Structures are given as C-alpha cells and as structure tokens.
Assembly symmetry: C3
Homo-oligomer: 499 residues x 3
Amino acid sequence: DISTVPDETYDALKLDRGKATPKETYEALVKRYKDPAHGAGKGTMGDYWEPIAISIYMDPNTFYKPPVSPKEVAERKDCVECHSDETPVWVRAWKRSTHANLDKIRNLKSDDPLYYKKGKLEEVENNLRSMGKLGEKETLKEVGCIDCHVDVNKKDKADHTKDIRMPTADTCGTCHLREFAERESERDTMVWPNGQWPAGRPSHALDYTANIETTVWATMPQREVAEGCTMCHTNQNKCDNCHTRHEFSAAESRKPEACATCHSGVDHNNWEAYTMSKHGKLAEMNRDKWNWEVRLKDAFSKGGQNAPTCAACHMEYEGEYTHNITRKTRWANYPFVPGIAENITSDWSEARLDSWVLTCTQCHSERFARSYLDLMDKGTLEGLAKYQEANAIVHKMYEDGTLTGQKTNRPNPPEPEKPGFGIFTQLFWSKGNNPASLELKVLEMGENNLAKMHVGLAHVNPGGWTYTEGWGPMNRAYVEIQDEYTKMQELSALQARVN
Amino acid sequence: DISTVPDETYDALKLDRGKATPKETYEALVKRYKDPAHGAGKGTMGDYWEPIAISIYMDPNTFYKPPVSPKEVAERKDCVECHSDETPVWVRAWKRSTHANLDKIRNLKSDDPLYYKKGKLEEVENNLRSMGKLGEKETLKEVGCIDCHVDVNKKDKADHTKDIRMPTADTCGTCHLREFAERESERDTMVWPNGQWPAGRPSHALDYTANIETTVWATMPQREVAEGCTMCHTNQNKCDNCHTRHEFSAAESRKPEACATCHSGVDHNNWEAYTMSKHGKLAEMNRDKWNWEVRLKDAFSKGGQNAPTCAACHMEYEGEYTHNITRKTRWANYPFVPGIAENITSDWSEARLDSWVLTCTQCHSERFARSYLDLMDKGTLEGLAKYQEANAIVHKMYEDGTLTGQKTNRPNPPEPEKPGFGIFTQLFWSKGNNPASLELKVLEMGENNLAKMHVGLAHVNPGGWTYTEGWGPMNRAYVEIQDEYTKMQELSALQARVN
Amino acid sequence: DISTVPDETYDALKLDRGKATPKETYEALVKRYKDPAHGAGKGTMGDYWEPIAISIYMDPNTFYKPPVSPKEVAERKDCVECHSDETPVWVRAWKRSTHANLDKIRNLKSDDPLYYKKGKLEEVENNLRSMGKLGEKETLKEVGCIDCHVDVNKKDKADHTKDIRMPTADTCGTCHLREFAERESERDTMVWPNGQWPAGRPSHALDYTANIETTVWATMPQREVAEGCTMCHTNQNKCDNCHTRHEFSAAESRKPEACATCHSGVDHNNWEAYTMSKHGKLAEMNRDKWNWEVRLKDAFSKGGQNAPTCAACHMEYEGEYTHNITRKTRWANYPFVPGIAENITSDWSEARLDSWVLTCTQCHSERFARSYLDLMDKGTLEGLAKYQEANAIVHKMYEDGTLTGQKTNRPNPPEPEKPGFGIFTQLFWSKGNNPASLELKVLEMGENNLAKMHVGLAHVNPGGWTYTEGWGPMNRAYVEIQDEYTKMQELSALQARVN
Ligand code: HEC
Ligand code: HEC
Ligand code: HEC
Ligand code: HEM
Ligand code: HEM
Ligand code: HEM
Ligand code: HEM
Ligand code: HEM
Ligand code: HEM
Ligand code: HEM
Ligand code: HEM
Ligand code: HEM
C-alpha cells in the first residue's frame, strides 16, 4: 500500500494492497517495465532501425555497455577521487547534493519546511530493507556514484569495464518506489473510453515506446535528425529529465523552465503560451519571492506562490500531488484526432472538467473558472471546424487524383510505411511530389496551427489563439488552399479546351 | 486641482481647476466614463453580438450580475473567513498587501524611499471625506474585500446574491482619483491634427471602446476566438492589468513583464523587440540590483536603474510621470495609416520628438539620441515605400477584377461589414476566395511585417527590422507578389490565344 | 611577452616575444589596426556609400568629430560636475564602477575571489609607464571621463569642441593591452586550410570590415535599414558590446544575455537554441546561485556554475580563457559554404574536435561528448544534402532560363553588384522578378533553415533541428519547390500545344 498509487495499478499487477511488501510491489512494476510486450526494447519496427553512438544513453537497458577504455577495478572512494580530476563538475555537483548529504536530512528541525524529507528518508530505508539492500539495523550512509552506477549499497570493488551501468527509472525506483510507481500507474490511469489514443498514452511512462512506434522514426534514413525526437522521449528510460543529472534538485523540477525544452515548439507550444500568459509572467516577476524548495503541496501557502506553474497544475489531482500526470487529460493536445471533440461532452470529460475547476478554485471563483474553460472548449471547436472546411477540399482533390504529381511524380514512402493522404511521415519525409504542397498545407494546419490554437487557449494566452498563433495562421492556410484550388480549377478548364 | 491632470481635461469636464472639489472632479469623470455617447456599453454594433459567460468579467458595468449560487448575507470579517477556505490564495495575497496593511504606510520613516505612500494615503482619505465616504475625523481602517466588492467603507452586512460587484476603473477611482483622472485625460490629450486616428486613441482609456467598434469583432460568429481580443482591451473597464489582482503591486507594474501579454505578437512585437535590445537585456541582467519598489520618479537615482523600461519611457512626459501614456505618440504603431507618414514633419511631431529626446538625454547625449531617432524615421519610411510598391500592384489587380475568384468565388463579408479590398476583416474572416492569396499577402505585409519593422526600429533591436523581422519578411512578400503577378500575366496570354 | 597571445601574432607583427616592450607591442597592433590595407576605413566600396548621422558612433576613427554645440574648455572635475546634470545616469553608472573605484582593487584581500583584479591593476600601470602615460613612481588615480574621452592620464584642461573623442578598441588597449592583443590575434589564428573564408574571419576583430565588404550593404539605397547590420558589426571599433557603456562590468559580459542581441535571429539563432537547451534552462534556473563576478577560469569551482554558457564554452581553448574566440571554429555557422563540409574530416577539424571534447569533459564523459558531437556532424550533413537536392532543381531552372521573369522582368542588381543566381543581395534587394520566388526559396533554405538546423544541433536543442526549426521548415521548402517545378512543367506542355 503506497497511498498515492491507484488501486487499478495494484489490480493490474496482481498485488494485494494491504499485503504487498515493498519488495513484491517493486518486483511487479519492473516486471512489466522491462517486458517488451509492454513497450520495452526496440519495438515492432526493430528490424528497420539501428542505434547510433548516443543511443546507449537514450536507452541503456537495450544498448548500454561499460566503457572498456579504462581498465580499472575501483571502490566507493576511488570513484570520487579519480573523477575529481576526470569529471570535475560531476563530483562537485554531487557533493553539494542531498544524496551526498544524508545527515542533514536526519537532523532536520520539525518546524523546518523541508522536514518532510526526513520521513522520505525513513521510507527509502525501509524499501531497501525489504529488498535486502539494507540491513535491519542499518542506515543509508549516502547515495554516491557506485550506488547508482553499479549496485545499491555496494560494499566491495567494482570492475569499471564490466560493472558500470547507466541508472534507468527502475534504478531510482529501488529507493524511490513511491515516485516510480506513481509514474508507472500512468499505464493504468490514462485509458480512453473509445480508443482515441493507445492505453496509457499520452504520458511519461510510455513516451519512449510512443517514439519508437512512430513509423517515420523507424523508416527515415536520417538517424541523427530522427534522434532529436528520442531526446524528448527519454522520460520512460531515465528520471534525470525534470530534476537534472547529479544535482537531482526537486526545487528545479518545480520551476517551469524544467519542462520547457520538450514542451515547446510548433505542434504544441506550452512553454511559449504559459510564459506569455499573466500566470506565466507573474511567475517570472515573482520567482524570487517564492520558495521553490517547498513541496508542491505547501507551495501556495508556505511557498508564497500566488501564480500557477506547469507542475502545480499538472501534478495536482484532487488535492493530492503525484508523479502521474494523466488523470485530467481531456483534449490530448491534438483536437483533430478522431473521437476527441466528439468525446468532449462525455461524463468522462465532464468529470475531468470538474477536476480542473477544483484546481482553478484554489485562487479564482468557480463561476470564473467555468466561464473560461467553457471558452477554451468552444474556441477549440471553432478552430477545428475551420480545419475541417479546408480539409474537406484538399481531401477530394486526393479522391479525384488531382493533387500535383499524384498520378505521375508521387514516390512511395519508406518501409514499413504505407502510402496515403496527409500522413505524419509527410512532416518528416518528402520526395518529388510526395507530399504535395496543398497536402502539406492542410496537414500543418491541423498538426501545427490548430494544435497551437488549443495550447494558447488552454494556457490563457490571448494572442496565442488569435493574431500571433492559431486563428491568424489558420486563416492564411485556408485562404491559400482556396486560392490554389481555384487556380487549378481554371488551369484544367483551359486544358480540356486544348484537349 | 490635481496637478498631474491636463488643463484640457478640466476644461472638457467643465470644471474650474481651483474650485473643483474631489467629489465634483470625480462625479464629472464618471459621468463621461459611464456615458454610452463616449464609449460605454455595447457600442454601435450592439445588435450584432451577444456576451458570452466570461464577458461579465471583461465588461462588468454592462454584464455583471451577482452569483446567486450562495445565498449569504455577510459582513466585513465574514468575507475573509469564508473565503479563507473558498478562495485560499485570494485571501492570502490580499492579507500580504498594502490594502490590508495600511498601518505600515502611516508609520513610515521619512528617510525611507517608500515614504511617498504615506502622503498618497492622506490624499485618498481626503478624497473619501469630500465624497462623504469617510468621516472628517476618521482614518481608512483598511481596503478589504467588502470595500471593493460592494461599497467603500461599508459597515453593515452585504447580501452576497444582490450586493456583490466587480471593481471597475471608477471603483478604484473613488480613492485613487489622481490615477483615474490621469488615465481618463487620455481622451483629451491624444488628439491628432488631421483625424488620422479617433480622438483619444490609441490609448488605455478607450481600448475597450476601440475593440467593440472593430466591425469584425462584432460580425464574426466565432465569439470565443473574438473574445481573445477583448482580453487585451480591458484596461478601460478594470485597473488590475499592469498591477494584477488582489496583490495590486506597483513594483510589479513597473517591470517590463507587466505589459508583455498584450504588447507582443505579429502586428506589434514591443515585448520581443525590447527584450532583445541592449536596454532590454541589461534589464534582465540587472533586474536583481534594482529596487522596483521605488516610484518611477526616483528609479534612475534611488532605484539604481541604469537601463530604460517600458514604463520609465512611456509614462514619463517632461520629467513628470503620469498614468496618461499618450502625450508622446507620433507613429501610432502602424506606419501605413493615411496621413501618418505625411504628418511626421509637422511641428506637432517635431514637438513630440523633442519630448522623446528629453527622455533619452537622462542617459545618452542629445546628439546621440537625435542620431538614432532620425534613423528610426527614415528607416520606417523605407519599409513603408516597399509596401506601397507591392500594394500598387495588387490594388490594380483588384481594379481590373483580376484577383483569383474576384468575379466568381468571392463571398461577401458578414454584416454590418461591407465588401472591399484589403480590409482588416480579411485577417479574421475568410470564405472561398475572399480574401484572395495576393490580397492577404499585401495586407499582412503592412499590418504585420511593416508594423514589426517599425517596432524593431523604435526599440533598438537591429535584427528586428533587418533579417529576422521587417525587411526580411517584406522582401519575401514583395518577391512572391511579383512572382505571382507575372505567372497570372502569362496564364492570361495563353488564355486569349485559346479564346 | 603577454603569455595569452599566440606566437603567430608576435611573428606577424615582427615582434621578438622576449624583447618587445608593452609600448612596442601596442604600437604594432595599432599600426595594423588603423591600417586600411587591413580592414580600416570605408573599404573597397567606399565610393558607393556615405555615412549617416549615427555613423560617427559606429565608426569613430573614420567619422567622429567633436560636438561643436557647447563651447567649453573643461578639466577632469568639470566633466563630472556638468554631466551630473547633463547626463545624470552616465555619471552615476561610472561612479559606481571599478574605473571610478580603483582604491578598492588595491586594498583587496588575497583570499577574496576578485583578488586577481589587483594584479590586473599593476599590469595596466606598467603598460602606461612603458608608454610614458604614467610616471615610474606613480599610480593610476582613476579612469574617468577625460581619460577615455580625450587623453589617458590627462592633467590640464580639454577643449570640448576640439578635443572630445569616442573611445575605440585601441583606446582601451592603452591600458588593456592583454585583452586588445588577444582579440587582435584573431586575424592571425582564424586561418582556414582551403580559403573557405577570408583570413581572420569570421571573428570579432574583423566584423566591421566584413560588414562594409558586403556588397549589398554598400549598394543598397536604404542606408537606415542597412545600418541595422552595422550595429551587430561594431565589436572591431568599440569594446563596449559585451560589457556595456560606462559601467563596463565583466560579470555582465559573462552572462549569456550579453551575446543575445547579435547572436540571434534567422541565419543563426544561437540565443534561442541555447536558452531552450538544458544547459541554457539550467542557466536561467541557477543564475541566482552563481557568482558571475568570478572570472571564467574559476567559474566551475569558486563560481558554483554547473552549466555551460556562451562565454565559458567559446572563450576557453585548452584550459586557458582568452578574448580570442576563433581557435575552435569548424563549421563557421553556414554548412552550405564550399569546402566546409568537405573539410570536416581534415586533421585540422579533427584537432579542433579534440579541443571541443576537452571543453565538454569538464562535466560529461568523453564517450558521451564524442557521441553527441558525432551526431552534430552527421546531422548537419543530412540537412545539407536536403538543401542540395532542392538546389539542384532550381539551379537548372536557371541554366534553362525558365525562372519566372528571367528572360523578361529580372532587373539587374545595384552597383558594384553583378547579376547571378542565388546571391546574398537577393535577401536584401528585390525588383520585379529579381529574385524569383523559387530562387528566394532555395536561398532561404540554406541561409536560414539549414543554418538554424546546425545551430540547433550545436546547441543541444532537439526541436531546434527537428520540428520547430531546421528539418521541419526545410521539408516544407523542398515540397513547395517540387510542387512548383511540376506546375511549371505542365504549364509549358500546354504552352507548346498552343504554340
Ligand atoms: C521535444 C521538443 C519533441 C520532439 C523533438 C519531438 N516530440 Fe513528439 N512530442 C513532444 C511532446 C511534448 C509531446 C506531447 C504532446 C502532447 O501535449 O500530447 C509529443 C507527442 C508525441 C506523440 C503522441 C502521443 C502518443 O502517440 O503516445 C508521439 C507518438 C511522438 N510525439 C513521437 C515523436 C517523433 C517520432 C518525433 C520525431 C520524428 C517527435 N515526436 C518529435 C515533444 C517532442
Ligand atoms: C493582445 C495580445 C491583443 C489582441 C489579442 C488583439 N489586440 Fe488589438 N491591439 C493590441 C495592442 C497592444 C494594441 C496597440 C497597438 C499600438 O501600438 O497602437 C492594439 C490595437 C488595436 C486597435 C487600434 C487603435 C484604435 O483603433 O483605437 C484596435 C481597434 C484593436 N487593436 C482591436 C482589436 C480586435 C477587435 C482584435 C481581434 C479581432 C484585436 N485588436 C486583437 C493588442 C491586442
Ligand atoms: C545582428 C542581429 C546581425 C545583423 C542585423 C546582421 N548580422 Fe551579419 N552576422 C551576425 C552574426 C552573429 C554573425 C556571425 C555568424 C556566425 O555564426 O558566423 C554574422 C555574420 C556575417 C558575415 C559572415 C562572416 C564574414 O564574411 O566575415 C558577414 C559578411 C555579415 N554578417 C554582414 C552582414 C550584413 C552586411 C548585414 C545586413 C545587410 C548583416 N550581416 C546583418 C549578426 C548580424
Ligand atoms: C535515479 C537516477 C534517482 C533520482 C531521479 C533521484 C532523485 C531524487 C530527488 C529529486 C531527490 C531530492 C533532492 C533534493 O534535496 O531536492 C532525491 C533525494 C533522495 N534520494 Fe534520490 N534519486 C535517484 C536515485 C536514488 C537512489 C538509488 C537512492 C537509494 C540508494 C536514492 C535515495 C535518496 C534519498 C534517501 C533522498 C533524500 C530524501 C528525499 O529528499 O527524499 N536516490 N533523489
Ligand atoms: C514539467 C514538470 C512537465 C510537465 C508539466 C509535463 C506535462 C506533460 C503532460 C500533461 C503530458 C501528458 C500527455 C498529454 O498531452 O495528455 C506529457 C507528455 C509528454 N511529455 Fe511532459 N511534462 C513535463 C516534463 C517533460 C520533460 C522534461 C520532457 C522531455 C524529455 C517531457 C516530454 C513529454 C513527452 C514526449 C510526452 C509524451 C506523450 C506520449 O507520446 O505518450 N515532459 N507531459
Ligand atoms: C522517475 C520515475 C523519477 C523518479 C524516481 C523521481 C524521484 C523524485 C523524488 C525522490 C522526489 C522527491 C524529492 C523531495 O525530497 O521532494 C521527486 C520530486 C519531484 N519530481 Fe521527480 N522523479 C522522477 C521523474 C520526474 C519527472 C519526469 C518529472 C517531470 C515531469 C518529475 C518532477 C518532479 C517534481 C515536480 C517534484 C516535486 C513534487 C512535489 O510534490 O513537490 N520527476 N522526484
Ligand atoms: C481598484 C481595483 C484598485 C486598484 C487598481 C488599486 C491599486 C493600488 C496600487 C497599485 C497600490 C499600491 C500598493 C503597493 O504597495 O505597491 C494601492 C495602494 C493603496 N490603495 Fe488601492 N487600489 C484599488 C482600490 C482601492 C480602493 C477602493 C481604495 C479606497 C478604499 C484604495 C486605497 C489605497 C490606499 C490608501 C493605498 C495605500 C497608499 C498608496 O500606496 O497609495 N485602493 N492601490
Ligand atoms: C506596461 C506598463 C504598458 C505600456 C508601457 C503600454 C504602452 C502602450 C502605449 C504607448 C499605448 C498607446 C497607443 C499607441 O500605440 O499610440 C498603448 C495602447 C494600448 N495598450 Fe498598452 N501598455 C502597457 C500595458 C497594457 C496592458 C497590460 C494591456 C493589455 C490588457 C495593454 C493594452 C493596450 C491596448 C489594447 C492598447 C489599445 C489602443 C487602442 O485601441 O486605442 N497595455 N499601450
Ligand atoms: C486604473 C485607472 C488604475 C488605477 C486606479 C491605478 C492605480 C494606481 C495606484 C494607486 C498607484 C500608486 C501606488 C503607489 O503607492 O505607488 C499606481 C501605480 C502604478 N500604476 Fe497604476 N493604476 C491604474 C491602471 C494602470 C495600468 C493599466 C497600468 C499599466 C499601463 C498602470 C501602471 C502603473 C505603474 C507603472 C505604477 C507606478 C508609477 C510610478 O510613478 O511609479 N496602472 N497605479
Ligand atoms: C575602453 C572603453 C575600456 C573598456 C572596454 C574597459 C573595460 C574594463 C572592464 C570590463 C573592467 C572590469 C570592471 C569590473 O570590475 O568588472 C575594467 C577594469 C579596469 N580598467 Fe578598464 N576599460 C576601458 C578603458 C580603460 C582605460 C583607458 C584604462 C586605463 C586608464 C582602464 C583601466 C582599468 C583598470 C586599471 C581596471 C581595474 C582592474 C581590472 O579589473 O582589470 N580601462 N575595464
Ligand atoms: C558573448 C560573450 C558572445 C559570444 C560567445 C560570441 C561568439 C561568436 C563566435 C564564436 C564568433 C566567431 C565566428 C564564427 O561563427 O565562427 C563570433 C562572430 C561574430 N560575433 Fe560574436 N559573440 C559574442 C558577442 C558578440 C556581440 C555582443 C556582438 C554584436 C555587436 C557579436 C557579433 C558578432 C559578429 C557580427 C560576428 C562577425 C563574424 C564576421 O563577420 O567575421 N558577438 N561571435
Ligand atoms: C575590446 C578589445 C575589449 C577590451 C579592451 C576588453 C577588456 C576587458 C577587460 C579589461 C576585462 C577584464 C576585467 C576583469 O577585471 O575581469 C575583460 C573581461 C571580459 N570581457 Fe572584455 N574586452 C573587450 C571586448 C570584449 C567583447 C567584444 C566581449 C564579448 C565577446 C568581451 C567579453 C569579456 C568577458 C566574458 C570577460 C571575462 C573573461 C574572464 O576570463 O572572466 N570583451 N574585458
């Protein structure tokens, strides 16, 4: 029983909540976690792609092998000493961290805000005892290099060339069970009522599985280009994304900047929308009066925070804060996806809308919160409708074989991808007249502009769904698509006249 | 007599400066303020649009009605207690504010920089006495929820369902007369010599009136989309825009981030230009060594500020700092507007240029300030000329009925909008071949690129008027317009040959 | 002998390292510096352009003349007094600076991190003695207005109208020899093995010479527009760019924001790529825990910095930090330039790659550093190849005289520029069908999108080379170019049929 983890997760793992020991609970999670039938490995399109050099870091459990360069057999203290010279900043950053400073956590004053960590330390120690990693009357001396890079509570020497590993999600989970299980519970909680999306997605628990299952990613020859997508989809394999390497600060992952590198760009510009909104701007202007060290639960009180942030909003469900960020997903970013809009009035959605009001009501009035969320929905449907109008046109042009080069110069897409109209692959692969200008236009209208229109609406950024983003760009796309349709229509007329 | 308010304002209101009491002065302002003949209400196109749920917040004086949900009759202390649970962050933010902490303002040390507030407190108290809101031998205990949300200095109980209101500009004005009048004086000060713009615009005093008077806004069916424009045009109705809700910090409104959400984007990117300039970058790098609590008047001395900011530059006229931001407007953002360029050499403009040098000369040499402002002007005329060349072309294409679908598929715009070439409505409404690709191109060249070219020039951002913005994009527009004109010209040739 | 300056520089100047006195060393540098045969003056295209008002500031040694406005003969103390009123912020900013506070530097504690400055003070004093600017038993009282704006260690009165100057690089060099020589050594160190770029470029030592030698800059009539390019190319003439005017803070130039105004935009978005990367985001989140006052050499230790920055990475060579930023340049930003890609596997490049690993290895493992730099290269070649495919097409269209208006409406470029296909001038000059839409497309594909693809790769920003920038935009360009080629191909078919 790890209170914050959903029953559903316990059930799926076949575990009895009030009976499962930490060892058992952990064993189950890792079972499913390292199982290829659940998303582990190279995927279904494995025969089409090969890993590049940096891939041993993006997916360790599949590609990482120890660096045979230095033939060294070292101990706990050797790792630090040698690396003081070899990787200077890596040793310093670690030493200045809680992993290297466990004593502080123990001698914490009860009236200190960061006191909750002392409890978290006890918990960890009990997880390790249950797993036989720690003796019953033994404390965790520290969390050093040898612990994460070879074995937890490793005493004896480690062979550098045959023992070094890269810490994956489950490695942290040996101690951070509560966090690991909460994230893994996403596979169980994000399940759509009509299969609009794959069970347990979109999420952080299956983001790498989602990346390797993207046909284009597996078929395109430009592995270096394609790899830039892998970097935004590593959360599943390693836990150093929000709270970065060696320092692993929780205060850092609470700041909006932590999500920014991944949650930005054309098909979703969460970072840009948020930073431009009042919430976001106030977060910039008041970041200095806020105590980011205080956990999310006490942020709006002891933390002094008076403006929402990415984590505050997305990691909160019904007053509880967890590592599972799926529980409130209604639009899953892309409004054009089948059965999404259609599902927006389901009791399923209604119940999640209620959860979102519960989040806005910590500050605003419910009447106010409901007034805006309603606009968010109807506004997304207005941008959606515009896309469908333009799409209706270009789609028939396809049905009629009238797209430029459709009959002549439209080379087939790379295997295992099959030909079609308006496919994602067209956003990353082009050859001759595949895709055709008008096709790419109607495509980017939905995948980029319509997507950004929603993001702007969801993140209270006026110009983000009006002039600057969304409507403005979409208005242009529709106009140009129209303007092209008519030109082609007049060209064909003259064509027939001649023949 | 409120020293900072222009004579013109007194005259227009029919008030004798050295005779008008605060009560009288206030009564006049609100008269014009709530008068539909001056911009209040739904406007001239009221029969075409209806307010949406969130509209009761954007325009309270027209749409707001108390939330009948909770049937409660409360007192001053009840508002706070109940809301401690109901709207947690709203109560905390207020308690931590000067409105909730009036005593501090009174016990202020004379040598303290924030001492001027003590005087501002006395003034307010006198405004209230004159209006019978405060007794002659009585102090303002505090500015709590019941004061702003029902009645100023309200003693007895308030009926939640029938008494609650949303504080509009005039509500703050009951106490903050000096600020209210300074902003309202914009109606009187921003008057152009040749009607290039509507009297009292562009400004914050008539920004909502300007929004509802935008035909497209009133005619377009997408009310949710259209509402994102209302959010950038609320300054007229409420004063919580620069210094946000419940905390109402003056230090906050002095920081560039406060203007950012509205003053950014395609048709004007003041935020982006500024942040990228040296002034702006230095403002980011030195924001921590600056005391933002110090009023604008003492910023460059006691505040330690050594780089200009949005407020420092725009709220300063001739050494004085006011809430009226119109007094120095020469180009009103859009250089293509009729008689603007043409007016750039008028004694009117000359005199405002002198006012701007007076602002730059607090730091730079006049010779230096004049060297750049001159470049700003000639540079804007060079971008303007480029637009006019491309415009000359597409305009004739219109005169000759040769725009794509002009004769056939060019549906009429929504009422009360009338058909035409290159209308603003084309930036927010499209149907078939209205507008036509080339039309939208020549349109966005002026409304977006040319506009941004100027903004870049005015806010010392090199790449903002050269490569990245302005010239670069405009060079492309001209090229593509040209390239299309010739193609259509050759297509018609072959047309005639066949018939 | 100034240890940090390359032998090559000594050799080129004809100086004997262990014999050249500071006076001699300085005399040599300035010789070449003020010599038109090396980049000084108006350049080879001088007869085509004239300086505008603000040009006296961008290139003082060529255009600046004292302001005859005020007829004043002043002394050291007069400059300050009068300017206290005339240029308020200019006097304050200076007074609060080290130039105005030399005593502090002298009484510095040895255990203080900013102690190294005391040594730098001694050095300067010795430079001045050697140049007869300072007496043997004399200290530098201070660095005030009269020193920089008339003469170093000036005693007597200065005539405002005939004596005032604008401090150029060599002016600072009278005291800051070490810094001046390090920057000038760029002319000697950035020399490519196959003339891919002009000797000593790209760099800061010859950035103005590079600007005036840009044909378009000299030929285009829009001097105000063209001047926005001069502002990003002033480093050669003045040293107030990274560490700005009057305060001249070294802590300021160490912060990423200092490079941002110039190193951003379409043809290179270093600022945007960096700020979005983990390195950059961590730099934003941890800028407050870092001591920017500590010199680069001690940043990663005493400074507490645990994330790289623009200066840390670019000013470091082999453990040493200098003002010369050329020593590690492999791709010089634009991958499409002839013989660049081709040179990427030369021992020259290999040796610079090794230098870059030496920089990444202060934190990451070499295996890790090498894994990413490899991806950076192969990834840039994949974006390059895509450009070449599209280019191959449009180029033949040129060879065949089939570009829109190529035979008819393609006006010649302004002198001294000669006609051609895909020239830089086409990015800043357009007339009729010159350039042609397809030409501008293939052009911006390389100069903007391909360039940004690389920058994204070099600055670890995933979306910067995938969706948002690079690949995404380039995929569109290729598609649209293709889509146009086919349309023109079918149009000509029907053409022949008619005739
Ligand atoms: C970081 C800047 C990203 C890059 C580069 C790529 N993706 Fe992406 N992707 C990103 C985010 C933040 C999200 C979530 C968006 C949301 O709000 O839902 C996504 C989403 C996807 C998904 C969809 C969900 C699912 O099917 O499970 C997939 C399949 C996906 N991304 C794959 C993918 C591929 C293969 C890319 C390059 C070829 C690509 N993404 C780039 C952020 C980033
Ligand atoms: C916030 C990001 C905005 C959105 C969304 C919209 N507008 Fe706007 N508008 C904005 C600013 C900051 C300004 C001032 C620009 C300047 O420098 O002058 C404007 C200006 C206008 C005006 C012009 C002045 C006048 O006629 O009085 C009008 C009429 C106006 N804006 C209306 C309007 C409408 C109706 C919009 C959507 C359909 C729209 N704006 C969006 C900022 C923002
Ligand atoms: C600041 C925002 C710039 C503006 C405006 C212009 N240029 Fe530029 N340019 C800029 C940078 C940061 C760089 C270096 C890019 C890199 O990573 O290498 C450049 C480079 C050039 C060069 C190339 C190198 C050389 O030939 O020596 C030249 C010739 C150059 N820039 C000239 C130039 C001209 C004339 C411009 C306007 C007409 C232009 N640049 C604008 C930044 C900026
Ligand atoms: C796996 C690479 C891993 C991650 C990720 C991780 C994260 C993490 C965070 C964010 C903190 C907070 C630090 C702060 O002060 O803000 C933290 C703290 C503790 N960790 Fe950890 N940690 C990772 C791995 C491990 C492993 C393998 C162990 C067990 C040997 C472990 C233990 C602890 C303990 C104990 C603490 C301190 C108490 C607490 O703050 O919870 N971590 N870790
Ligand atoms: C920062 C603390 C942060 C937040 C907040 C956040 C949110 C978020 C949500 C709400 C989702 C759910 C999917 C949906 O749209 O319904 C989600 C999904 C993905 N995220 Fe995320 N995310 C934050 C941080 C991070 C970081 C640091 C990265 C990049 C390494 C990242 C990436 C992604 C990706 C990719 C998805 C994948 C969805 C899928 O394909 O199944 N997130 N995130
Ligand atoms: C990977 C499954 C993973 C682990 C494990 C992990 C651990 C971890 C710990 C131990 C803490 C507690 C530290 C403390 O003392 O407060 C913690 C806190 C936060 N994390 Fe985490 N975390 C993992 C992954 C991720 C990812 C991918 C994100 C970003 C979407 C993320 C974010 C956060 C945040 C926010 C906190 C603070 C939460 C709070 O209630 O204050 N973590 N993490
Ligand atoms: C209307 C919603 C309203 C606004 C807006 C507003 C703003 C405002 C600011 C910016 C301050 C400064 C706070 C700081 O410390 O920086 C401030 C201060 C005072 N106010 Fe106020 N205020 C609004 C409404 C009202 C009303 C209705 C009253 C009168 C009952 C009132 C009074 C005061 C007083 C007094 C002060 C303190 C002294 C001062 O700083 O001027 N406010 N307010
Ligand atoms: C931040 C303190 C801030 C500044 C500075 C500022 C300036 C500004 C100017 C100079 C104008 C005058 C119009 C002109 O271009 O000549 C103006 C006009 C508008 N503003 Fe503004 N503004 C600042 C803040 C705010 C905020 C917070 C918003 C958004 C709610 C905002 C909005 C607008 C709008 C809209 C106009 C309207 C002009 C009209 O239509 O008549 N401003 N602003
Ligand atoms: C709406 C008409 C409105 C009112 C009323 C108002 C009040 C207000 C007060 C009382 C202050 C003084 C607080 C103090 O103690 O210093 C004050 C100060 C500033 N305001 Fe304001 N304000 C109103 C509206 C707006 C708007 C729309 C803006 C942004 C364009 C704005 C900005 C500012 C700024 C800046 C300050 C500080 C000015 C200074 O001289 O320091 N206000 N406001
Ligand atoms: C030329 C306009 C010029 C520049 C540029 C410049 C820069 C510079 C910096 C960045 C500092 C550091 C200040 C800090 O505390 O971070 C600095 C310091 C000193 N300078 Fe200087 N300086 C310029 C010009 C001159 C001239 C003409 C002299 C000689 C009369 C001079 C001297 C000094 C001295 C001495 C110091 C203090 C010691 C040190 O930090 O090196 N400077 N300057
Ligand atoms: C900030 C400390 C900063 C850094 C870092 C930086 C880097 C940089 C490099 C690596 C080059 C070399 C050229 C190449 O790409 O190989 C370079 C060149 C130029 N820079 Fe720079 N630069 C920084 C700061 C500044 C500043 C503040 C400006 C703008 C006034 C600026 C400008 C330029 C320009 C222009 C070039 C010219 C190259 C040429 O044409 O020869 N840099 N910079
Ligand atoms: C122009 C040739 C120029 C001079 C001269 C100059 C001087 C200068 C000094 C005296 C210092 C030392 C100050 C101290 O006490 O630490 C110094 C330091 C830095 N500078 Fe510089 N500088 C000149 C030009 C430039 C330019 C164009 C840049 C930006 C690319 C730049 C940057 C820096 C940085 C960074 C530092 C700190 C270096 C460190 O090792 O800490 N300078 N400069």
